[PDB]
Amino acid sequence: VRKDPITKEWTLEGGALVLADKGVCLIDEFDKMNDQDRTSIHEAMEQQSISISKAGIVTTLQARCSIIAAANPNGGRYNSTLPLAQNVSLTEPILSRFDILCVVRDLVDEEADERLATFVVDSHVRSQLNARQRRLQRQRKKEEEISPIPQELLMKYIHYART
Amino acid sequence: ELGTSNLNLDARNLLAYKQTEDLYHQLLNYPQEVISIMDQTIKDCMVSLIVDNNLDYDLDEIETKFYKVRPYNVGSCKGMRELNPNDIDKLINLKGLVLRSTPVIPDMKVAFFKCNVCDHTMAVEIDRGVIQEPARCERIDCNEPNSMSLIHNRCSFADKQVIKLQETPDFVPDGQTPHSISLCVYDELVDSCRAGDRIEVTGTFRSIPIRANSRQRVLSLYKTYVDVVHVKKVSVRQITDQDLAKIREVAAREDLYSLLARSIAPSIYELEDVKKGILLQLFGGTNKTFTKGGRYRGDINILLCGDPSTSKSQILQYVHKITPRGVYTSGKGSSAVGLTAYITRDVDTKQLVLESGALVLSDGGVCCIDEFDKMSDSTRSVLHEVMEQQTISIAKAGIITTLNARSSILASANPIGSRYNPNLPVTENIDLPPPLLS
């Protein structure tokens, strides 16, 4: 609720979520400010389409937003053989709103490492009407080393795969 | 032989002279005409010395620029609760306090006119409250009542400044609030009456009407003021040669080590070791800066801590006595934001003003600062930065500036428990960041 100017009224100004209908936030580990806002995002999914009435009007907007997050364990990924409630600092109910806890791991692998290591170095090698067209085919071929259906058309059918 | 235009007349001589009594009491009774008579005399009495020797500044140029006189200290007054309405054109001798000022607005001493003919540069005088205008053309024999325009930025104007005063509360009977009165100056007594000092003014009296409605000429509780003729305050040096000869014998004396050791303490107990640092801090080297590389200044930073009540302040007060330009710290009158970087709303225009900090303000002195065990840790944050780069970096949304500060410091701490509690490592008593130990 942004306050009024002199001849105005206490109006309602949205922030992040009411803009982002189909988007992204982030909650990893703001440890001090964890108890501040986590009581405002786990009621965005549970009590889906949430709005509030501080010192103003009692309305309720609509927000069918999507959440992703990139949390970070305290130190290493296997901080314990002990389970996930020992590993993360979150508790159960806010954790239980999600669908899956995708977890990563690697200790030591010869063939898997080059499969990253040979892979990553070739990416750094990727650093007038005909010429405007000819740069485009160069821009088309440079994405088409294995030709995995490039982004010139791929995003374009997503928007009507959702509507 | 100096050329100045000002004679500060004591004007307490006509009562000490057998004649000029009727002059003297007319002076306290018509004080606009009688100065205008006396300004004709001094220019003519200057000619009365000019007619003696005809080799005196070519007899023209010191006879064109006018002079003026300044009667002062005339009679006495007592305050402001005596200003009766009959005192219409009299001399008044105020004793009070200047508070705040304003920049100069201009006056109307000469006008200019031009209508839409090819060329007309008349310059009408005013000398009144009434500008008079023509309604017929000029510069031709047959041209009608034309549109006369007012080319304002051509005719010259002098200065004028209004200054607000409030009386010094002198023997006020513990119930009355000191009220206000204003000033008006005309001559070059501007920029010498800075706001914040004791004052004794010598002025005449005048009252003016006010417009009641802002857009009518209708008017009736009047406002008065005073018009100063001469002011007086509450009370690169010109280096001579007898001082240099006197100091050089003092510089020839072996005892200057101890003669300056004894002279800083007219009352203080002995404690010779702190007398070396305090003296040498004021004798603070110079700025031996190279052209490329270095940028080293010879400034130092002594400190004292330990036993309370060892004239900790009066020694520092003694240092403030011997420095003409320095700063004095406050008891929590400053903070992390109350030092510099200001967004204050002044009562004159409600706009921005960046006032400097006390640290940059002592550019040419020694910053005296205290209560360092009790200074908060939101502050005690910029003095490290002035301890390294001699500057203040202002992180304000108004502006960015790495303005320097050519300033020197001493520190005066306080213990915590009772004392310096020896047979203990005393650093654990006085808590302090080990970075600023360096």
């Binding site: 922030g15 030591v108 990553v120 750094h124 990727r126 | 100069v104 930025n153 003021y225 270095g294 003003v353």
Partner: protein, 614 residues
């Protein structure tokens, strides 16, 4: 009689652009510079001149230079009429101005009253609170639609909303006006306030100020925040009390005399203001010199010996700070991630030692690089923190010496003494070059690409030896691996190294003993790296195969077990490994990358990883 006087000063000025103003022939300094002032102008088409006060003083010996201070405030349209007369005779949409500069005497703002009206007086000061860019008029062609509204009227003065002089036919005059937008040229300006300097303020005595209009190409050239000088024409301004909705102090006591004009009885007051014309802010073979200096051989060692005289020895730390000073590459993959722009190197060590010297060195040496201590961790600065509402706006952006390290290498010390909240905040500021904020107001994405450089403190002041740095880092774990290696400075109480450092330090604070010869200057190193930045060196050789094995050998060492140290030098560090390698080749100006160049890249981290390992 003054008409010919202005006509006298017209041609006398004109012949000055006809005569020479040059004393030296063919030792540089080509004769007749004002014709070159025309000819530079007829290419880039900027519509200025730039005349000095020296050469007009030393032409008439003050017969005219004392006259021109007291004519041009009235005779603006005389000198400019003359230069219009001379350009037709010389050159073939044209609007000009007259820009004097460099009068001798510079005053302060407290010395401007009586003689200063219509004069020319250079004024110093500092500037605060700019405003925006709007257009002005100076000439219109508005007229009434009585019969014909095509009368180009005159007198666009301070109240110019009434063109009412000399109508075209015998029609109704001053009946209307139509200010078209189609035929009258405009000129753009802004209104600014100034303020008095800090080395002149007598006491803290509410330091007074005034305002100034700058109107030519001077627009958006006074950046707010500098010690600045000005042109000098002083001017008064009224308010005419126009047809708008409106028409303590005894102000306008002067203006009570100013009553009874031919229009309505009021009080027209005044205030002294300022009009400027020209701003300033005081506060080859050299292009061939690079081509010789690029063709040297030992300039890698010449550079590392010529960094800073404030330290002796330790060539390891000196090699690092040079590479930080230059930039690497930042261009990366198509459609997605922007990779790292640079390398970030910290140094730990005992305080009150040689650590402070580099910090003192770079902030005057680097382009626009800033320095903070970071103890102010809760208000703003390091932590980017929104300001509260002021003068009609809540949620505005803030300062902080982080988002202004554009082409700057910000420096910041003492990581131990701050809180825990910033330690994830700058951790976000390290990986990708943006930061995000959505604090009490809309979201913000500011892309402040940066290059940090740090100097924190050990846990005890003295560095442990038998242990590792995992205990003496005094930070958390993932920001270590997010960083490169620190090149820890060690110390010793040796009876020889002290005396030589004593002799090394005593010549420094000599008043003059400049016997040390750095082979490069401050500036000729500065332009040299400015030649170095403008390449894009790409590897093309087969040392990619040579690259991948050594890291594959490297990572199998520091992984001492399945449950050993989590200083596991991962796939992040291949990027710094190659982006150091293009940077060191950007020092020796080679575009291809040899397998020989990355060899010393390896042993830079071999010597680092032994300083990692016990």
């Amino acid at each position: 009689v003054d008409d010919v006087t202005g006509e006298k000063v017209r041609e006398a000025f004109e012949q000055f652009l006809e005569d020479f103003s040059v004393q030296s022939t063919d030792t540089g300094e080509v004769e007749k510079v004002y014709r070159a002032q025309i000819e530079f102008m007829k290419i880039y088409d900027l519509n200025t001149i730039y005349i000095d006060y020296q050469h007009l003083s030393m032409r008439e010996n003050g017969a005219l230079a004392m006259a021109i201070s007291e004519q041009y405030y009235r005779f603006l349209p005389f000198l400019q009429k003359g230069l219009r007369r001379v350009v037709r005779k010389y050159a073939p949409e044209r609007v000009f101005q007259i820009s004097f500069f460099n009068l001798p005497t510079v005053h302060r703002i407290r010395d401007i009253r009586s003689e200063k009206i219509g004069s020319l007086l250079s004024i110093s000061g500092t500037v605060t609170r700019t405003s925006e860019v709007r257009p002005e008029l100076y000439k219109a062609s508005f007229t009434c639609d009585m019969c014909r509204a095509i009368v180009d009227n005159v007198e666009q003065s301070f109240k110019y909303t009434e063109p009412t002089f000399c109508p075209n036919p015998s029609c109704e005059n001053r009946a209307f006006w139509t200010l078209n937008v189609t035929r009258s040229r405009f000129l753009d300006w802004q209104k600014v306030r100034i303020q008095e300097n800090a080395n002149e303020i007598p006491t803290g005595s509410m330091p007074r100020t005034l305002d100034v209009i700058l109107r030519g190409d001077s627009v958006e050239r006074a950046k707010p925040g500098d010690r600045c000088k000005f042109t000098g024409v002083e001017i008064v301004v009224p308010d005419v009390t126009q047809l708008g909705l409106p028409g303590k102090t005894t102000e306008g006591l002067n203006s009570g005399v100013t009553g009874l004009r031919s229009l309505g009885v009021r009080d027209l007051t005044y205030k002294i203001s300022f009009l400027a014309c020209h701003v300033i802010s005081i506060g080859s073979d050299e292009i061939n010199e690079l081509k010789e200096m690029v063709k040297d051989e030992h300039i890698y060692d010449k550079l590392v010996r010529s960094i800073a005289p404030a330290v002796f020895g330790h060539e390891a730390v000196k090699k690092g700070i040079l590479l930080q000073m230059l930039g690497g590459v930042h261009k990366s993959t198509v459609e997605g991630i922007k990779l790292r722009g640079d390398i970030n190197i910290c140094v730990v060590g005992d305080p009150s030692t040689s650590k402070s010297q580099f910090l003192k060195y770079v902030v005057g040496f680097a382009p626009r690089s800033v320095y903070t201590s970071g103890k102010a961790s809760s208000a703003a600065g390091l932590t980017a923190a929104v300001v509260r509402d002021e003068e009609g706006g809540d949620y505005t952006i803030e300062a902080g010496a982080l988002m202004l390290a554009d082409n700057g290498i910000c420096c910041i010390d003492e990581f131990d003494k701050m809180d825990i909240s910033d330690q994830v905040a700058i951790h976000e500021a390290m990986e990708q070059q943006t930061i995000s904020i959505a604090k009490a107001g809309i979201h913000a994405t500011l892309n402040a690409r940066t290059s940090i450089l740090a100097a924190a403190n050990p846990v005890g002041g003295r560095y442990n030896r038998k242990l590792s740095l995992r205990g003496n880092l005094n930070m958390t774990a993932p920001i270590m691996s997010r960083f490169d290696l620190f090149f820890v400075i060690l110390d010793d109480c040796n009876e020889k190294i002290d005396t030589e450092l004593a002799s090394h330090i005593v010549d420094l604070h000599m008043k003059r003993d400049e016997a040390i010869e750095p082979p490069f200057s401050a500036e000729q190193l500065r332009r040299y790296i400015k030649y170095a930045r403008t390449f894009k060196p790409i590897l093309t050789k087969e040392a990619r195969s040579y690259l991948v094995e050594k890291y594959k050998e490297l990572r199998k060492d520091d992984a001492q077990g399945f449950s050993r140290s989590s200083y596991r030098i991962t796939v992040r560090q291949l990027e710094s490994m190659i982006r150091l390698s293009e940077a060191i080749a950007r020092a020796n100006c080679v575009d291809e990358i040899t397998p020989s160049f990355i060899a010393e890249a390896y042993d830079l981290l071999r010597q680092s990883i032994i300083r990692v390992d016990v």
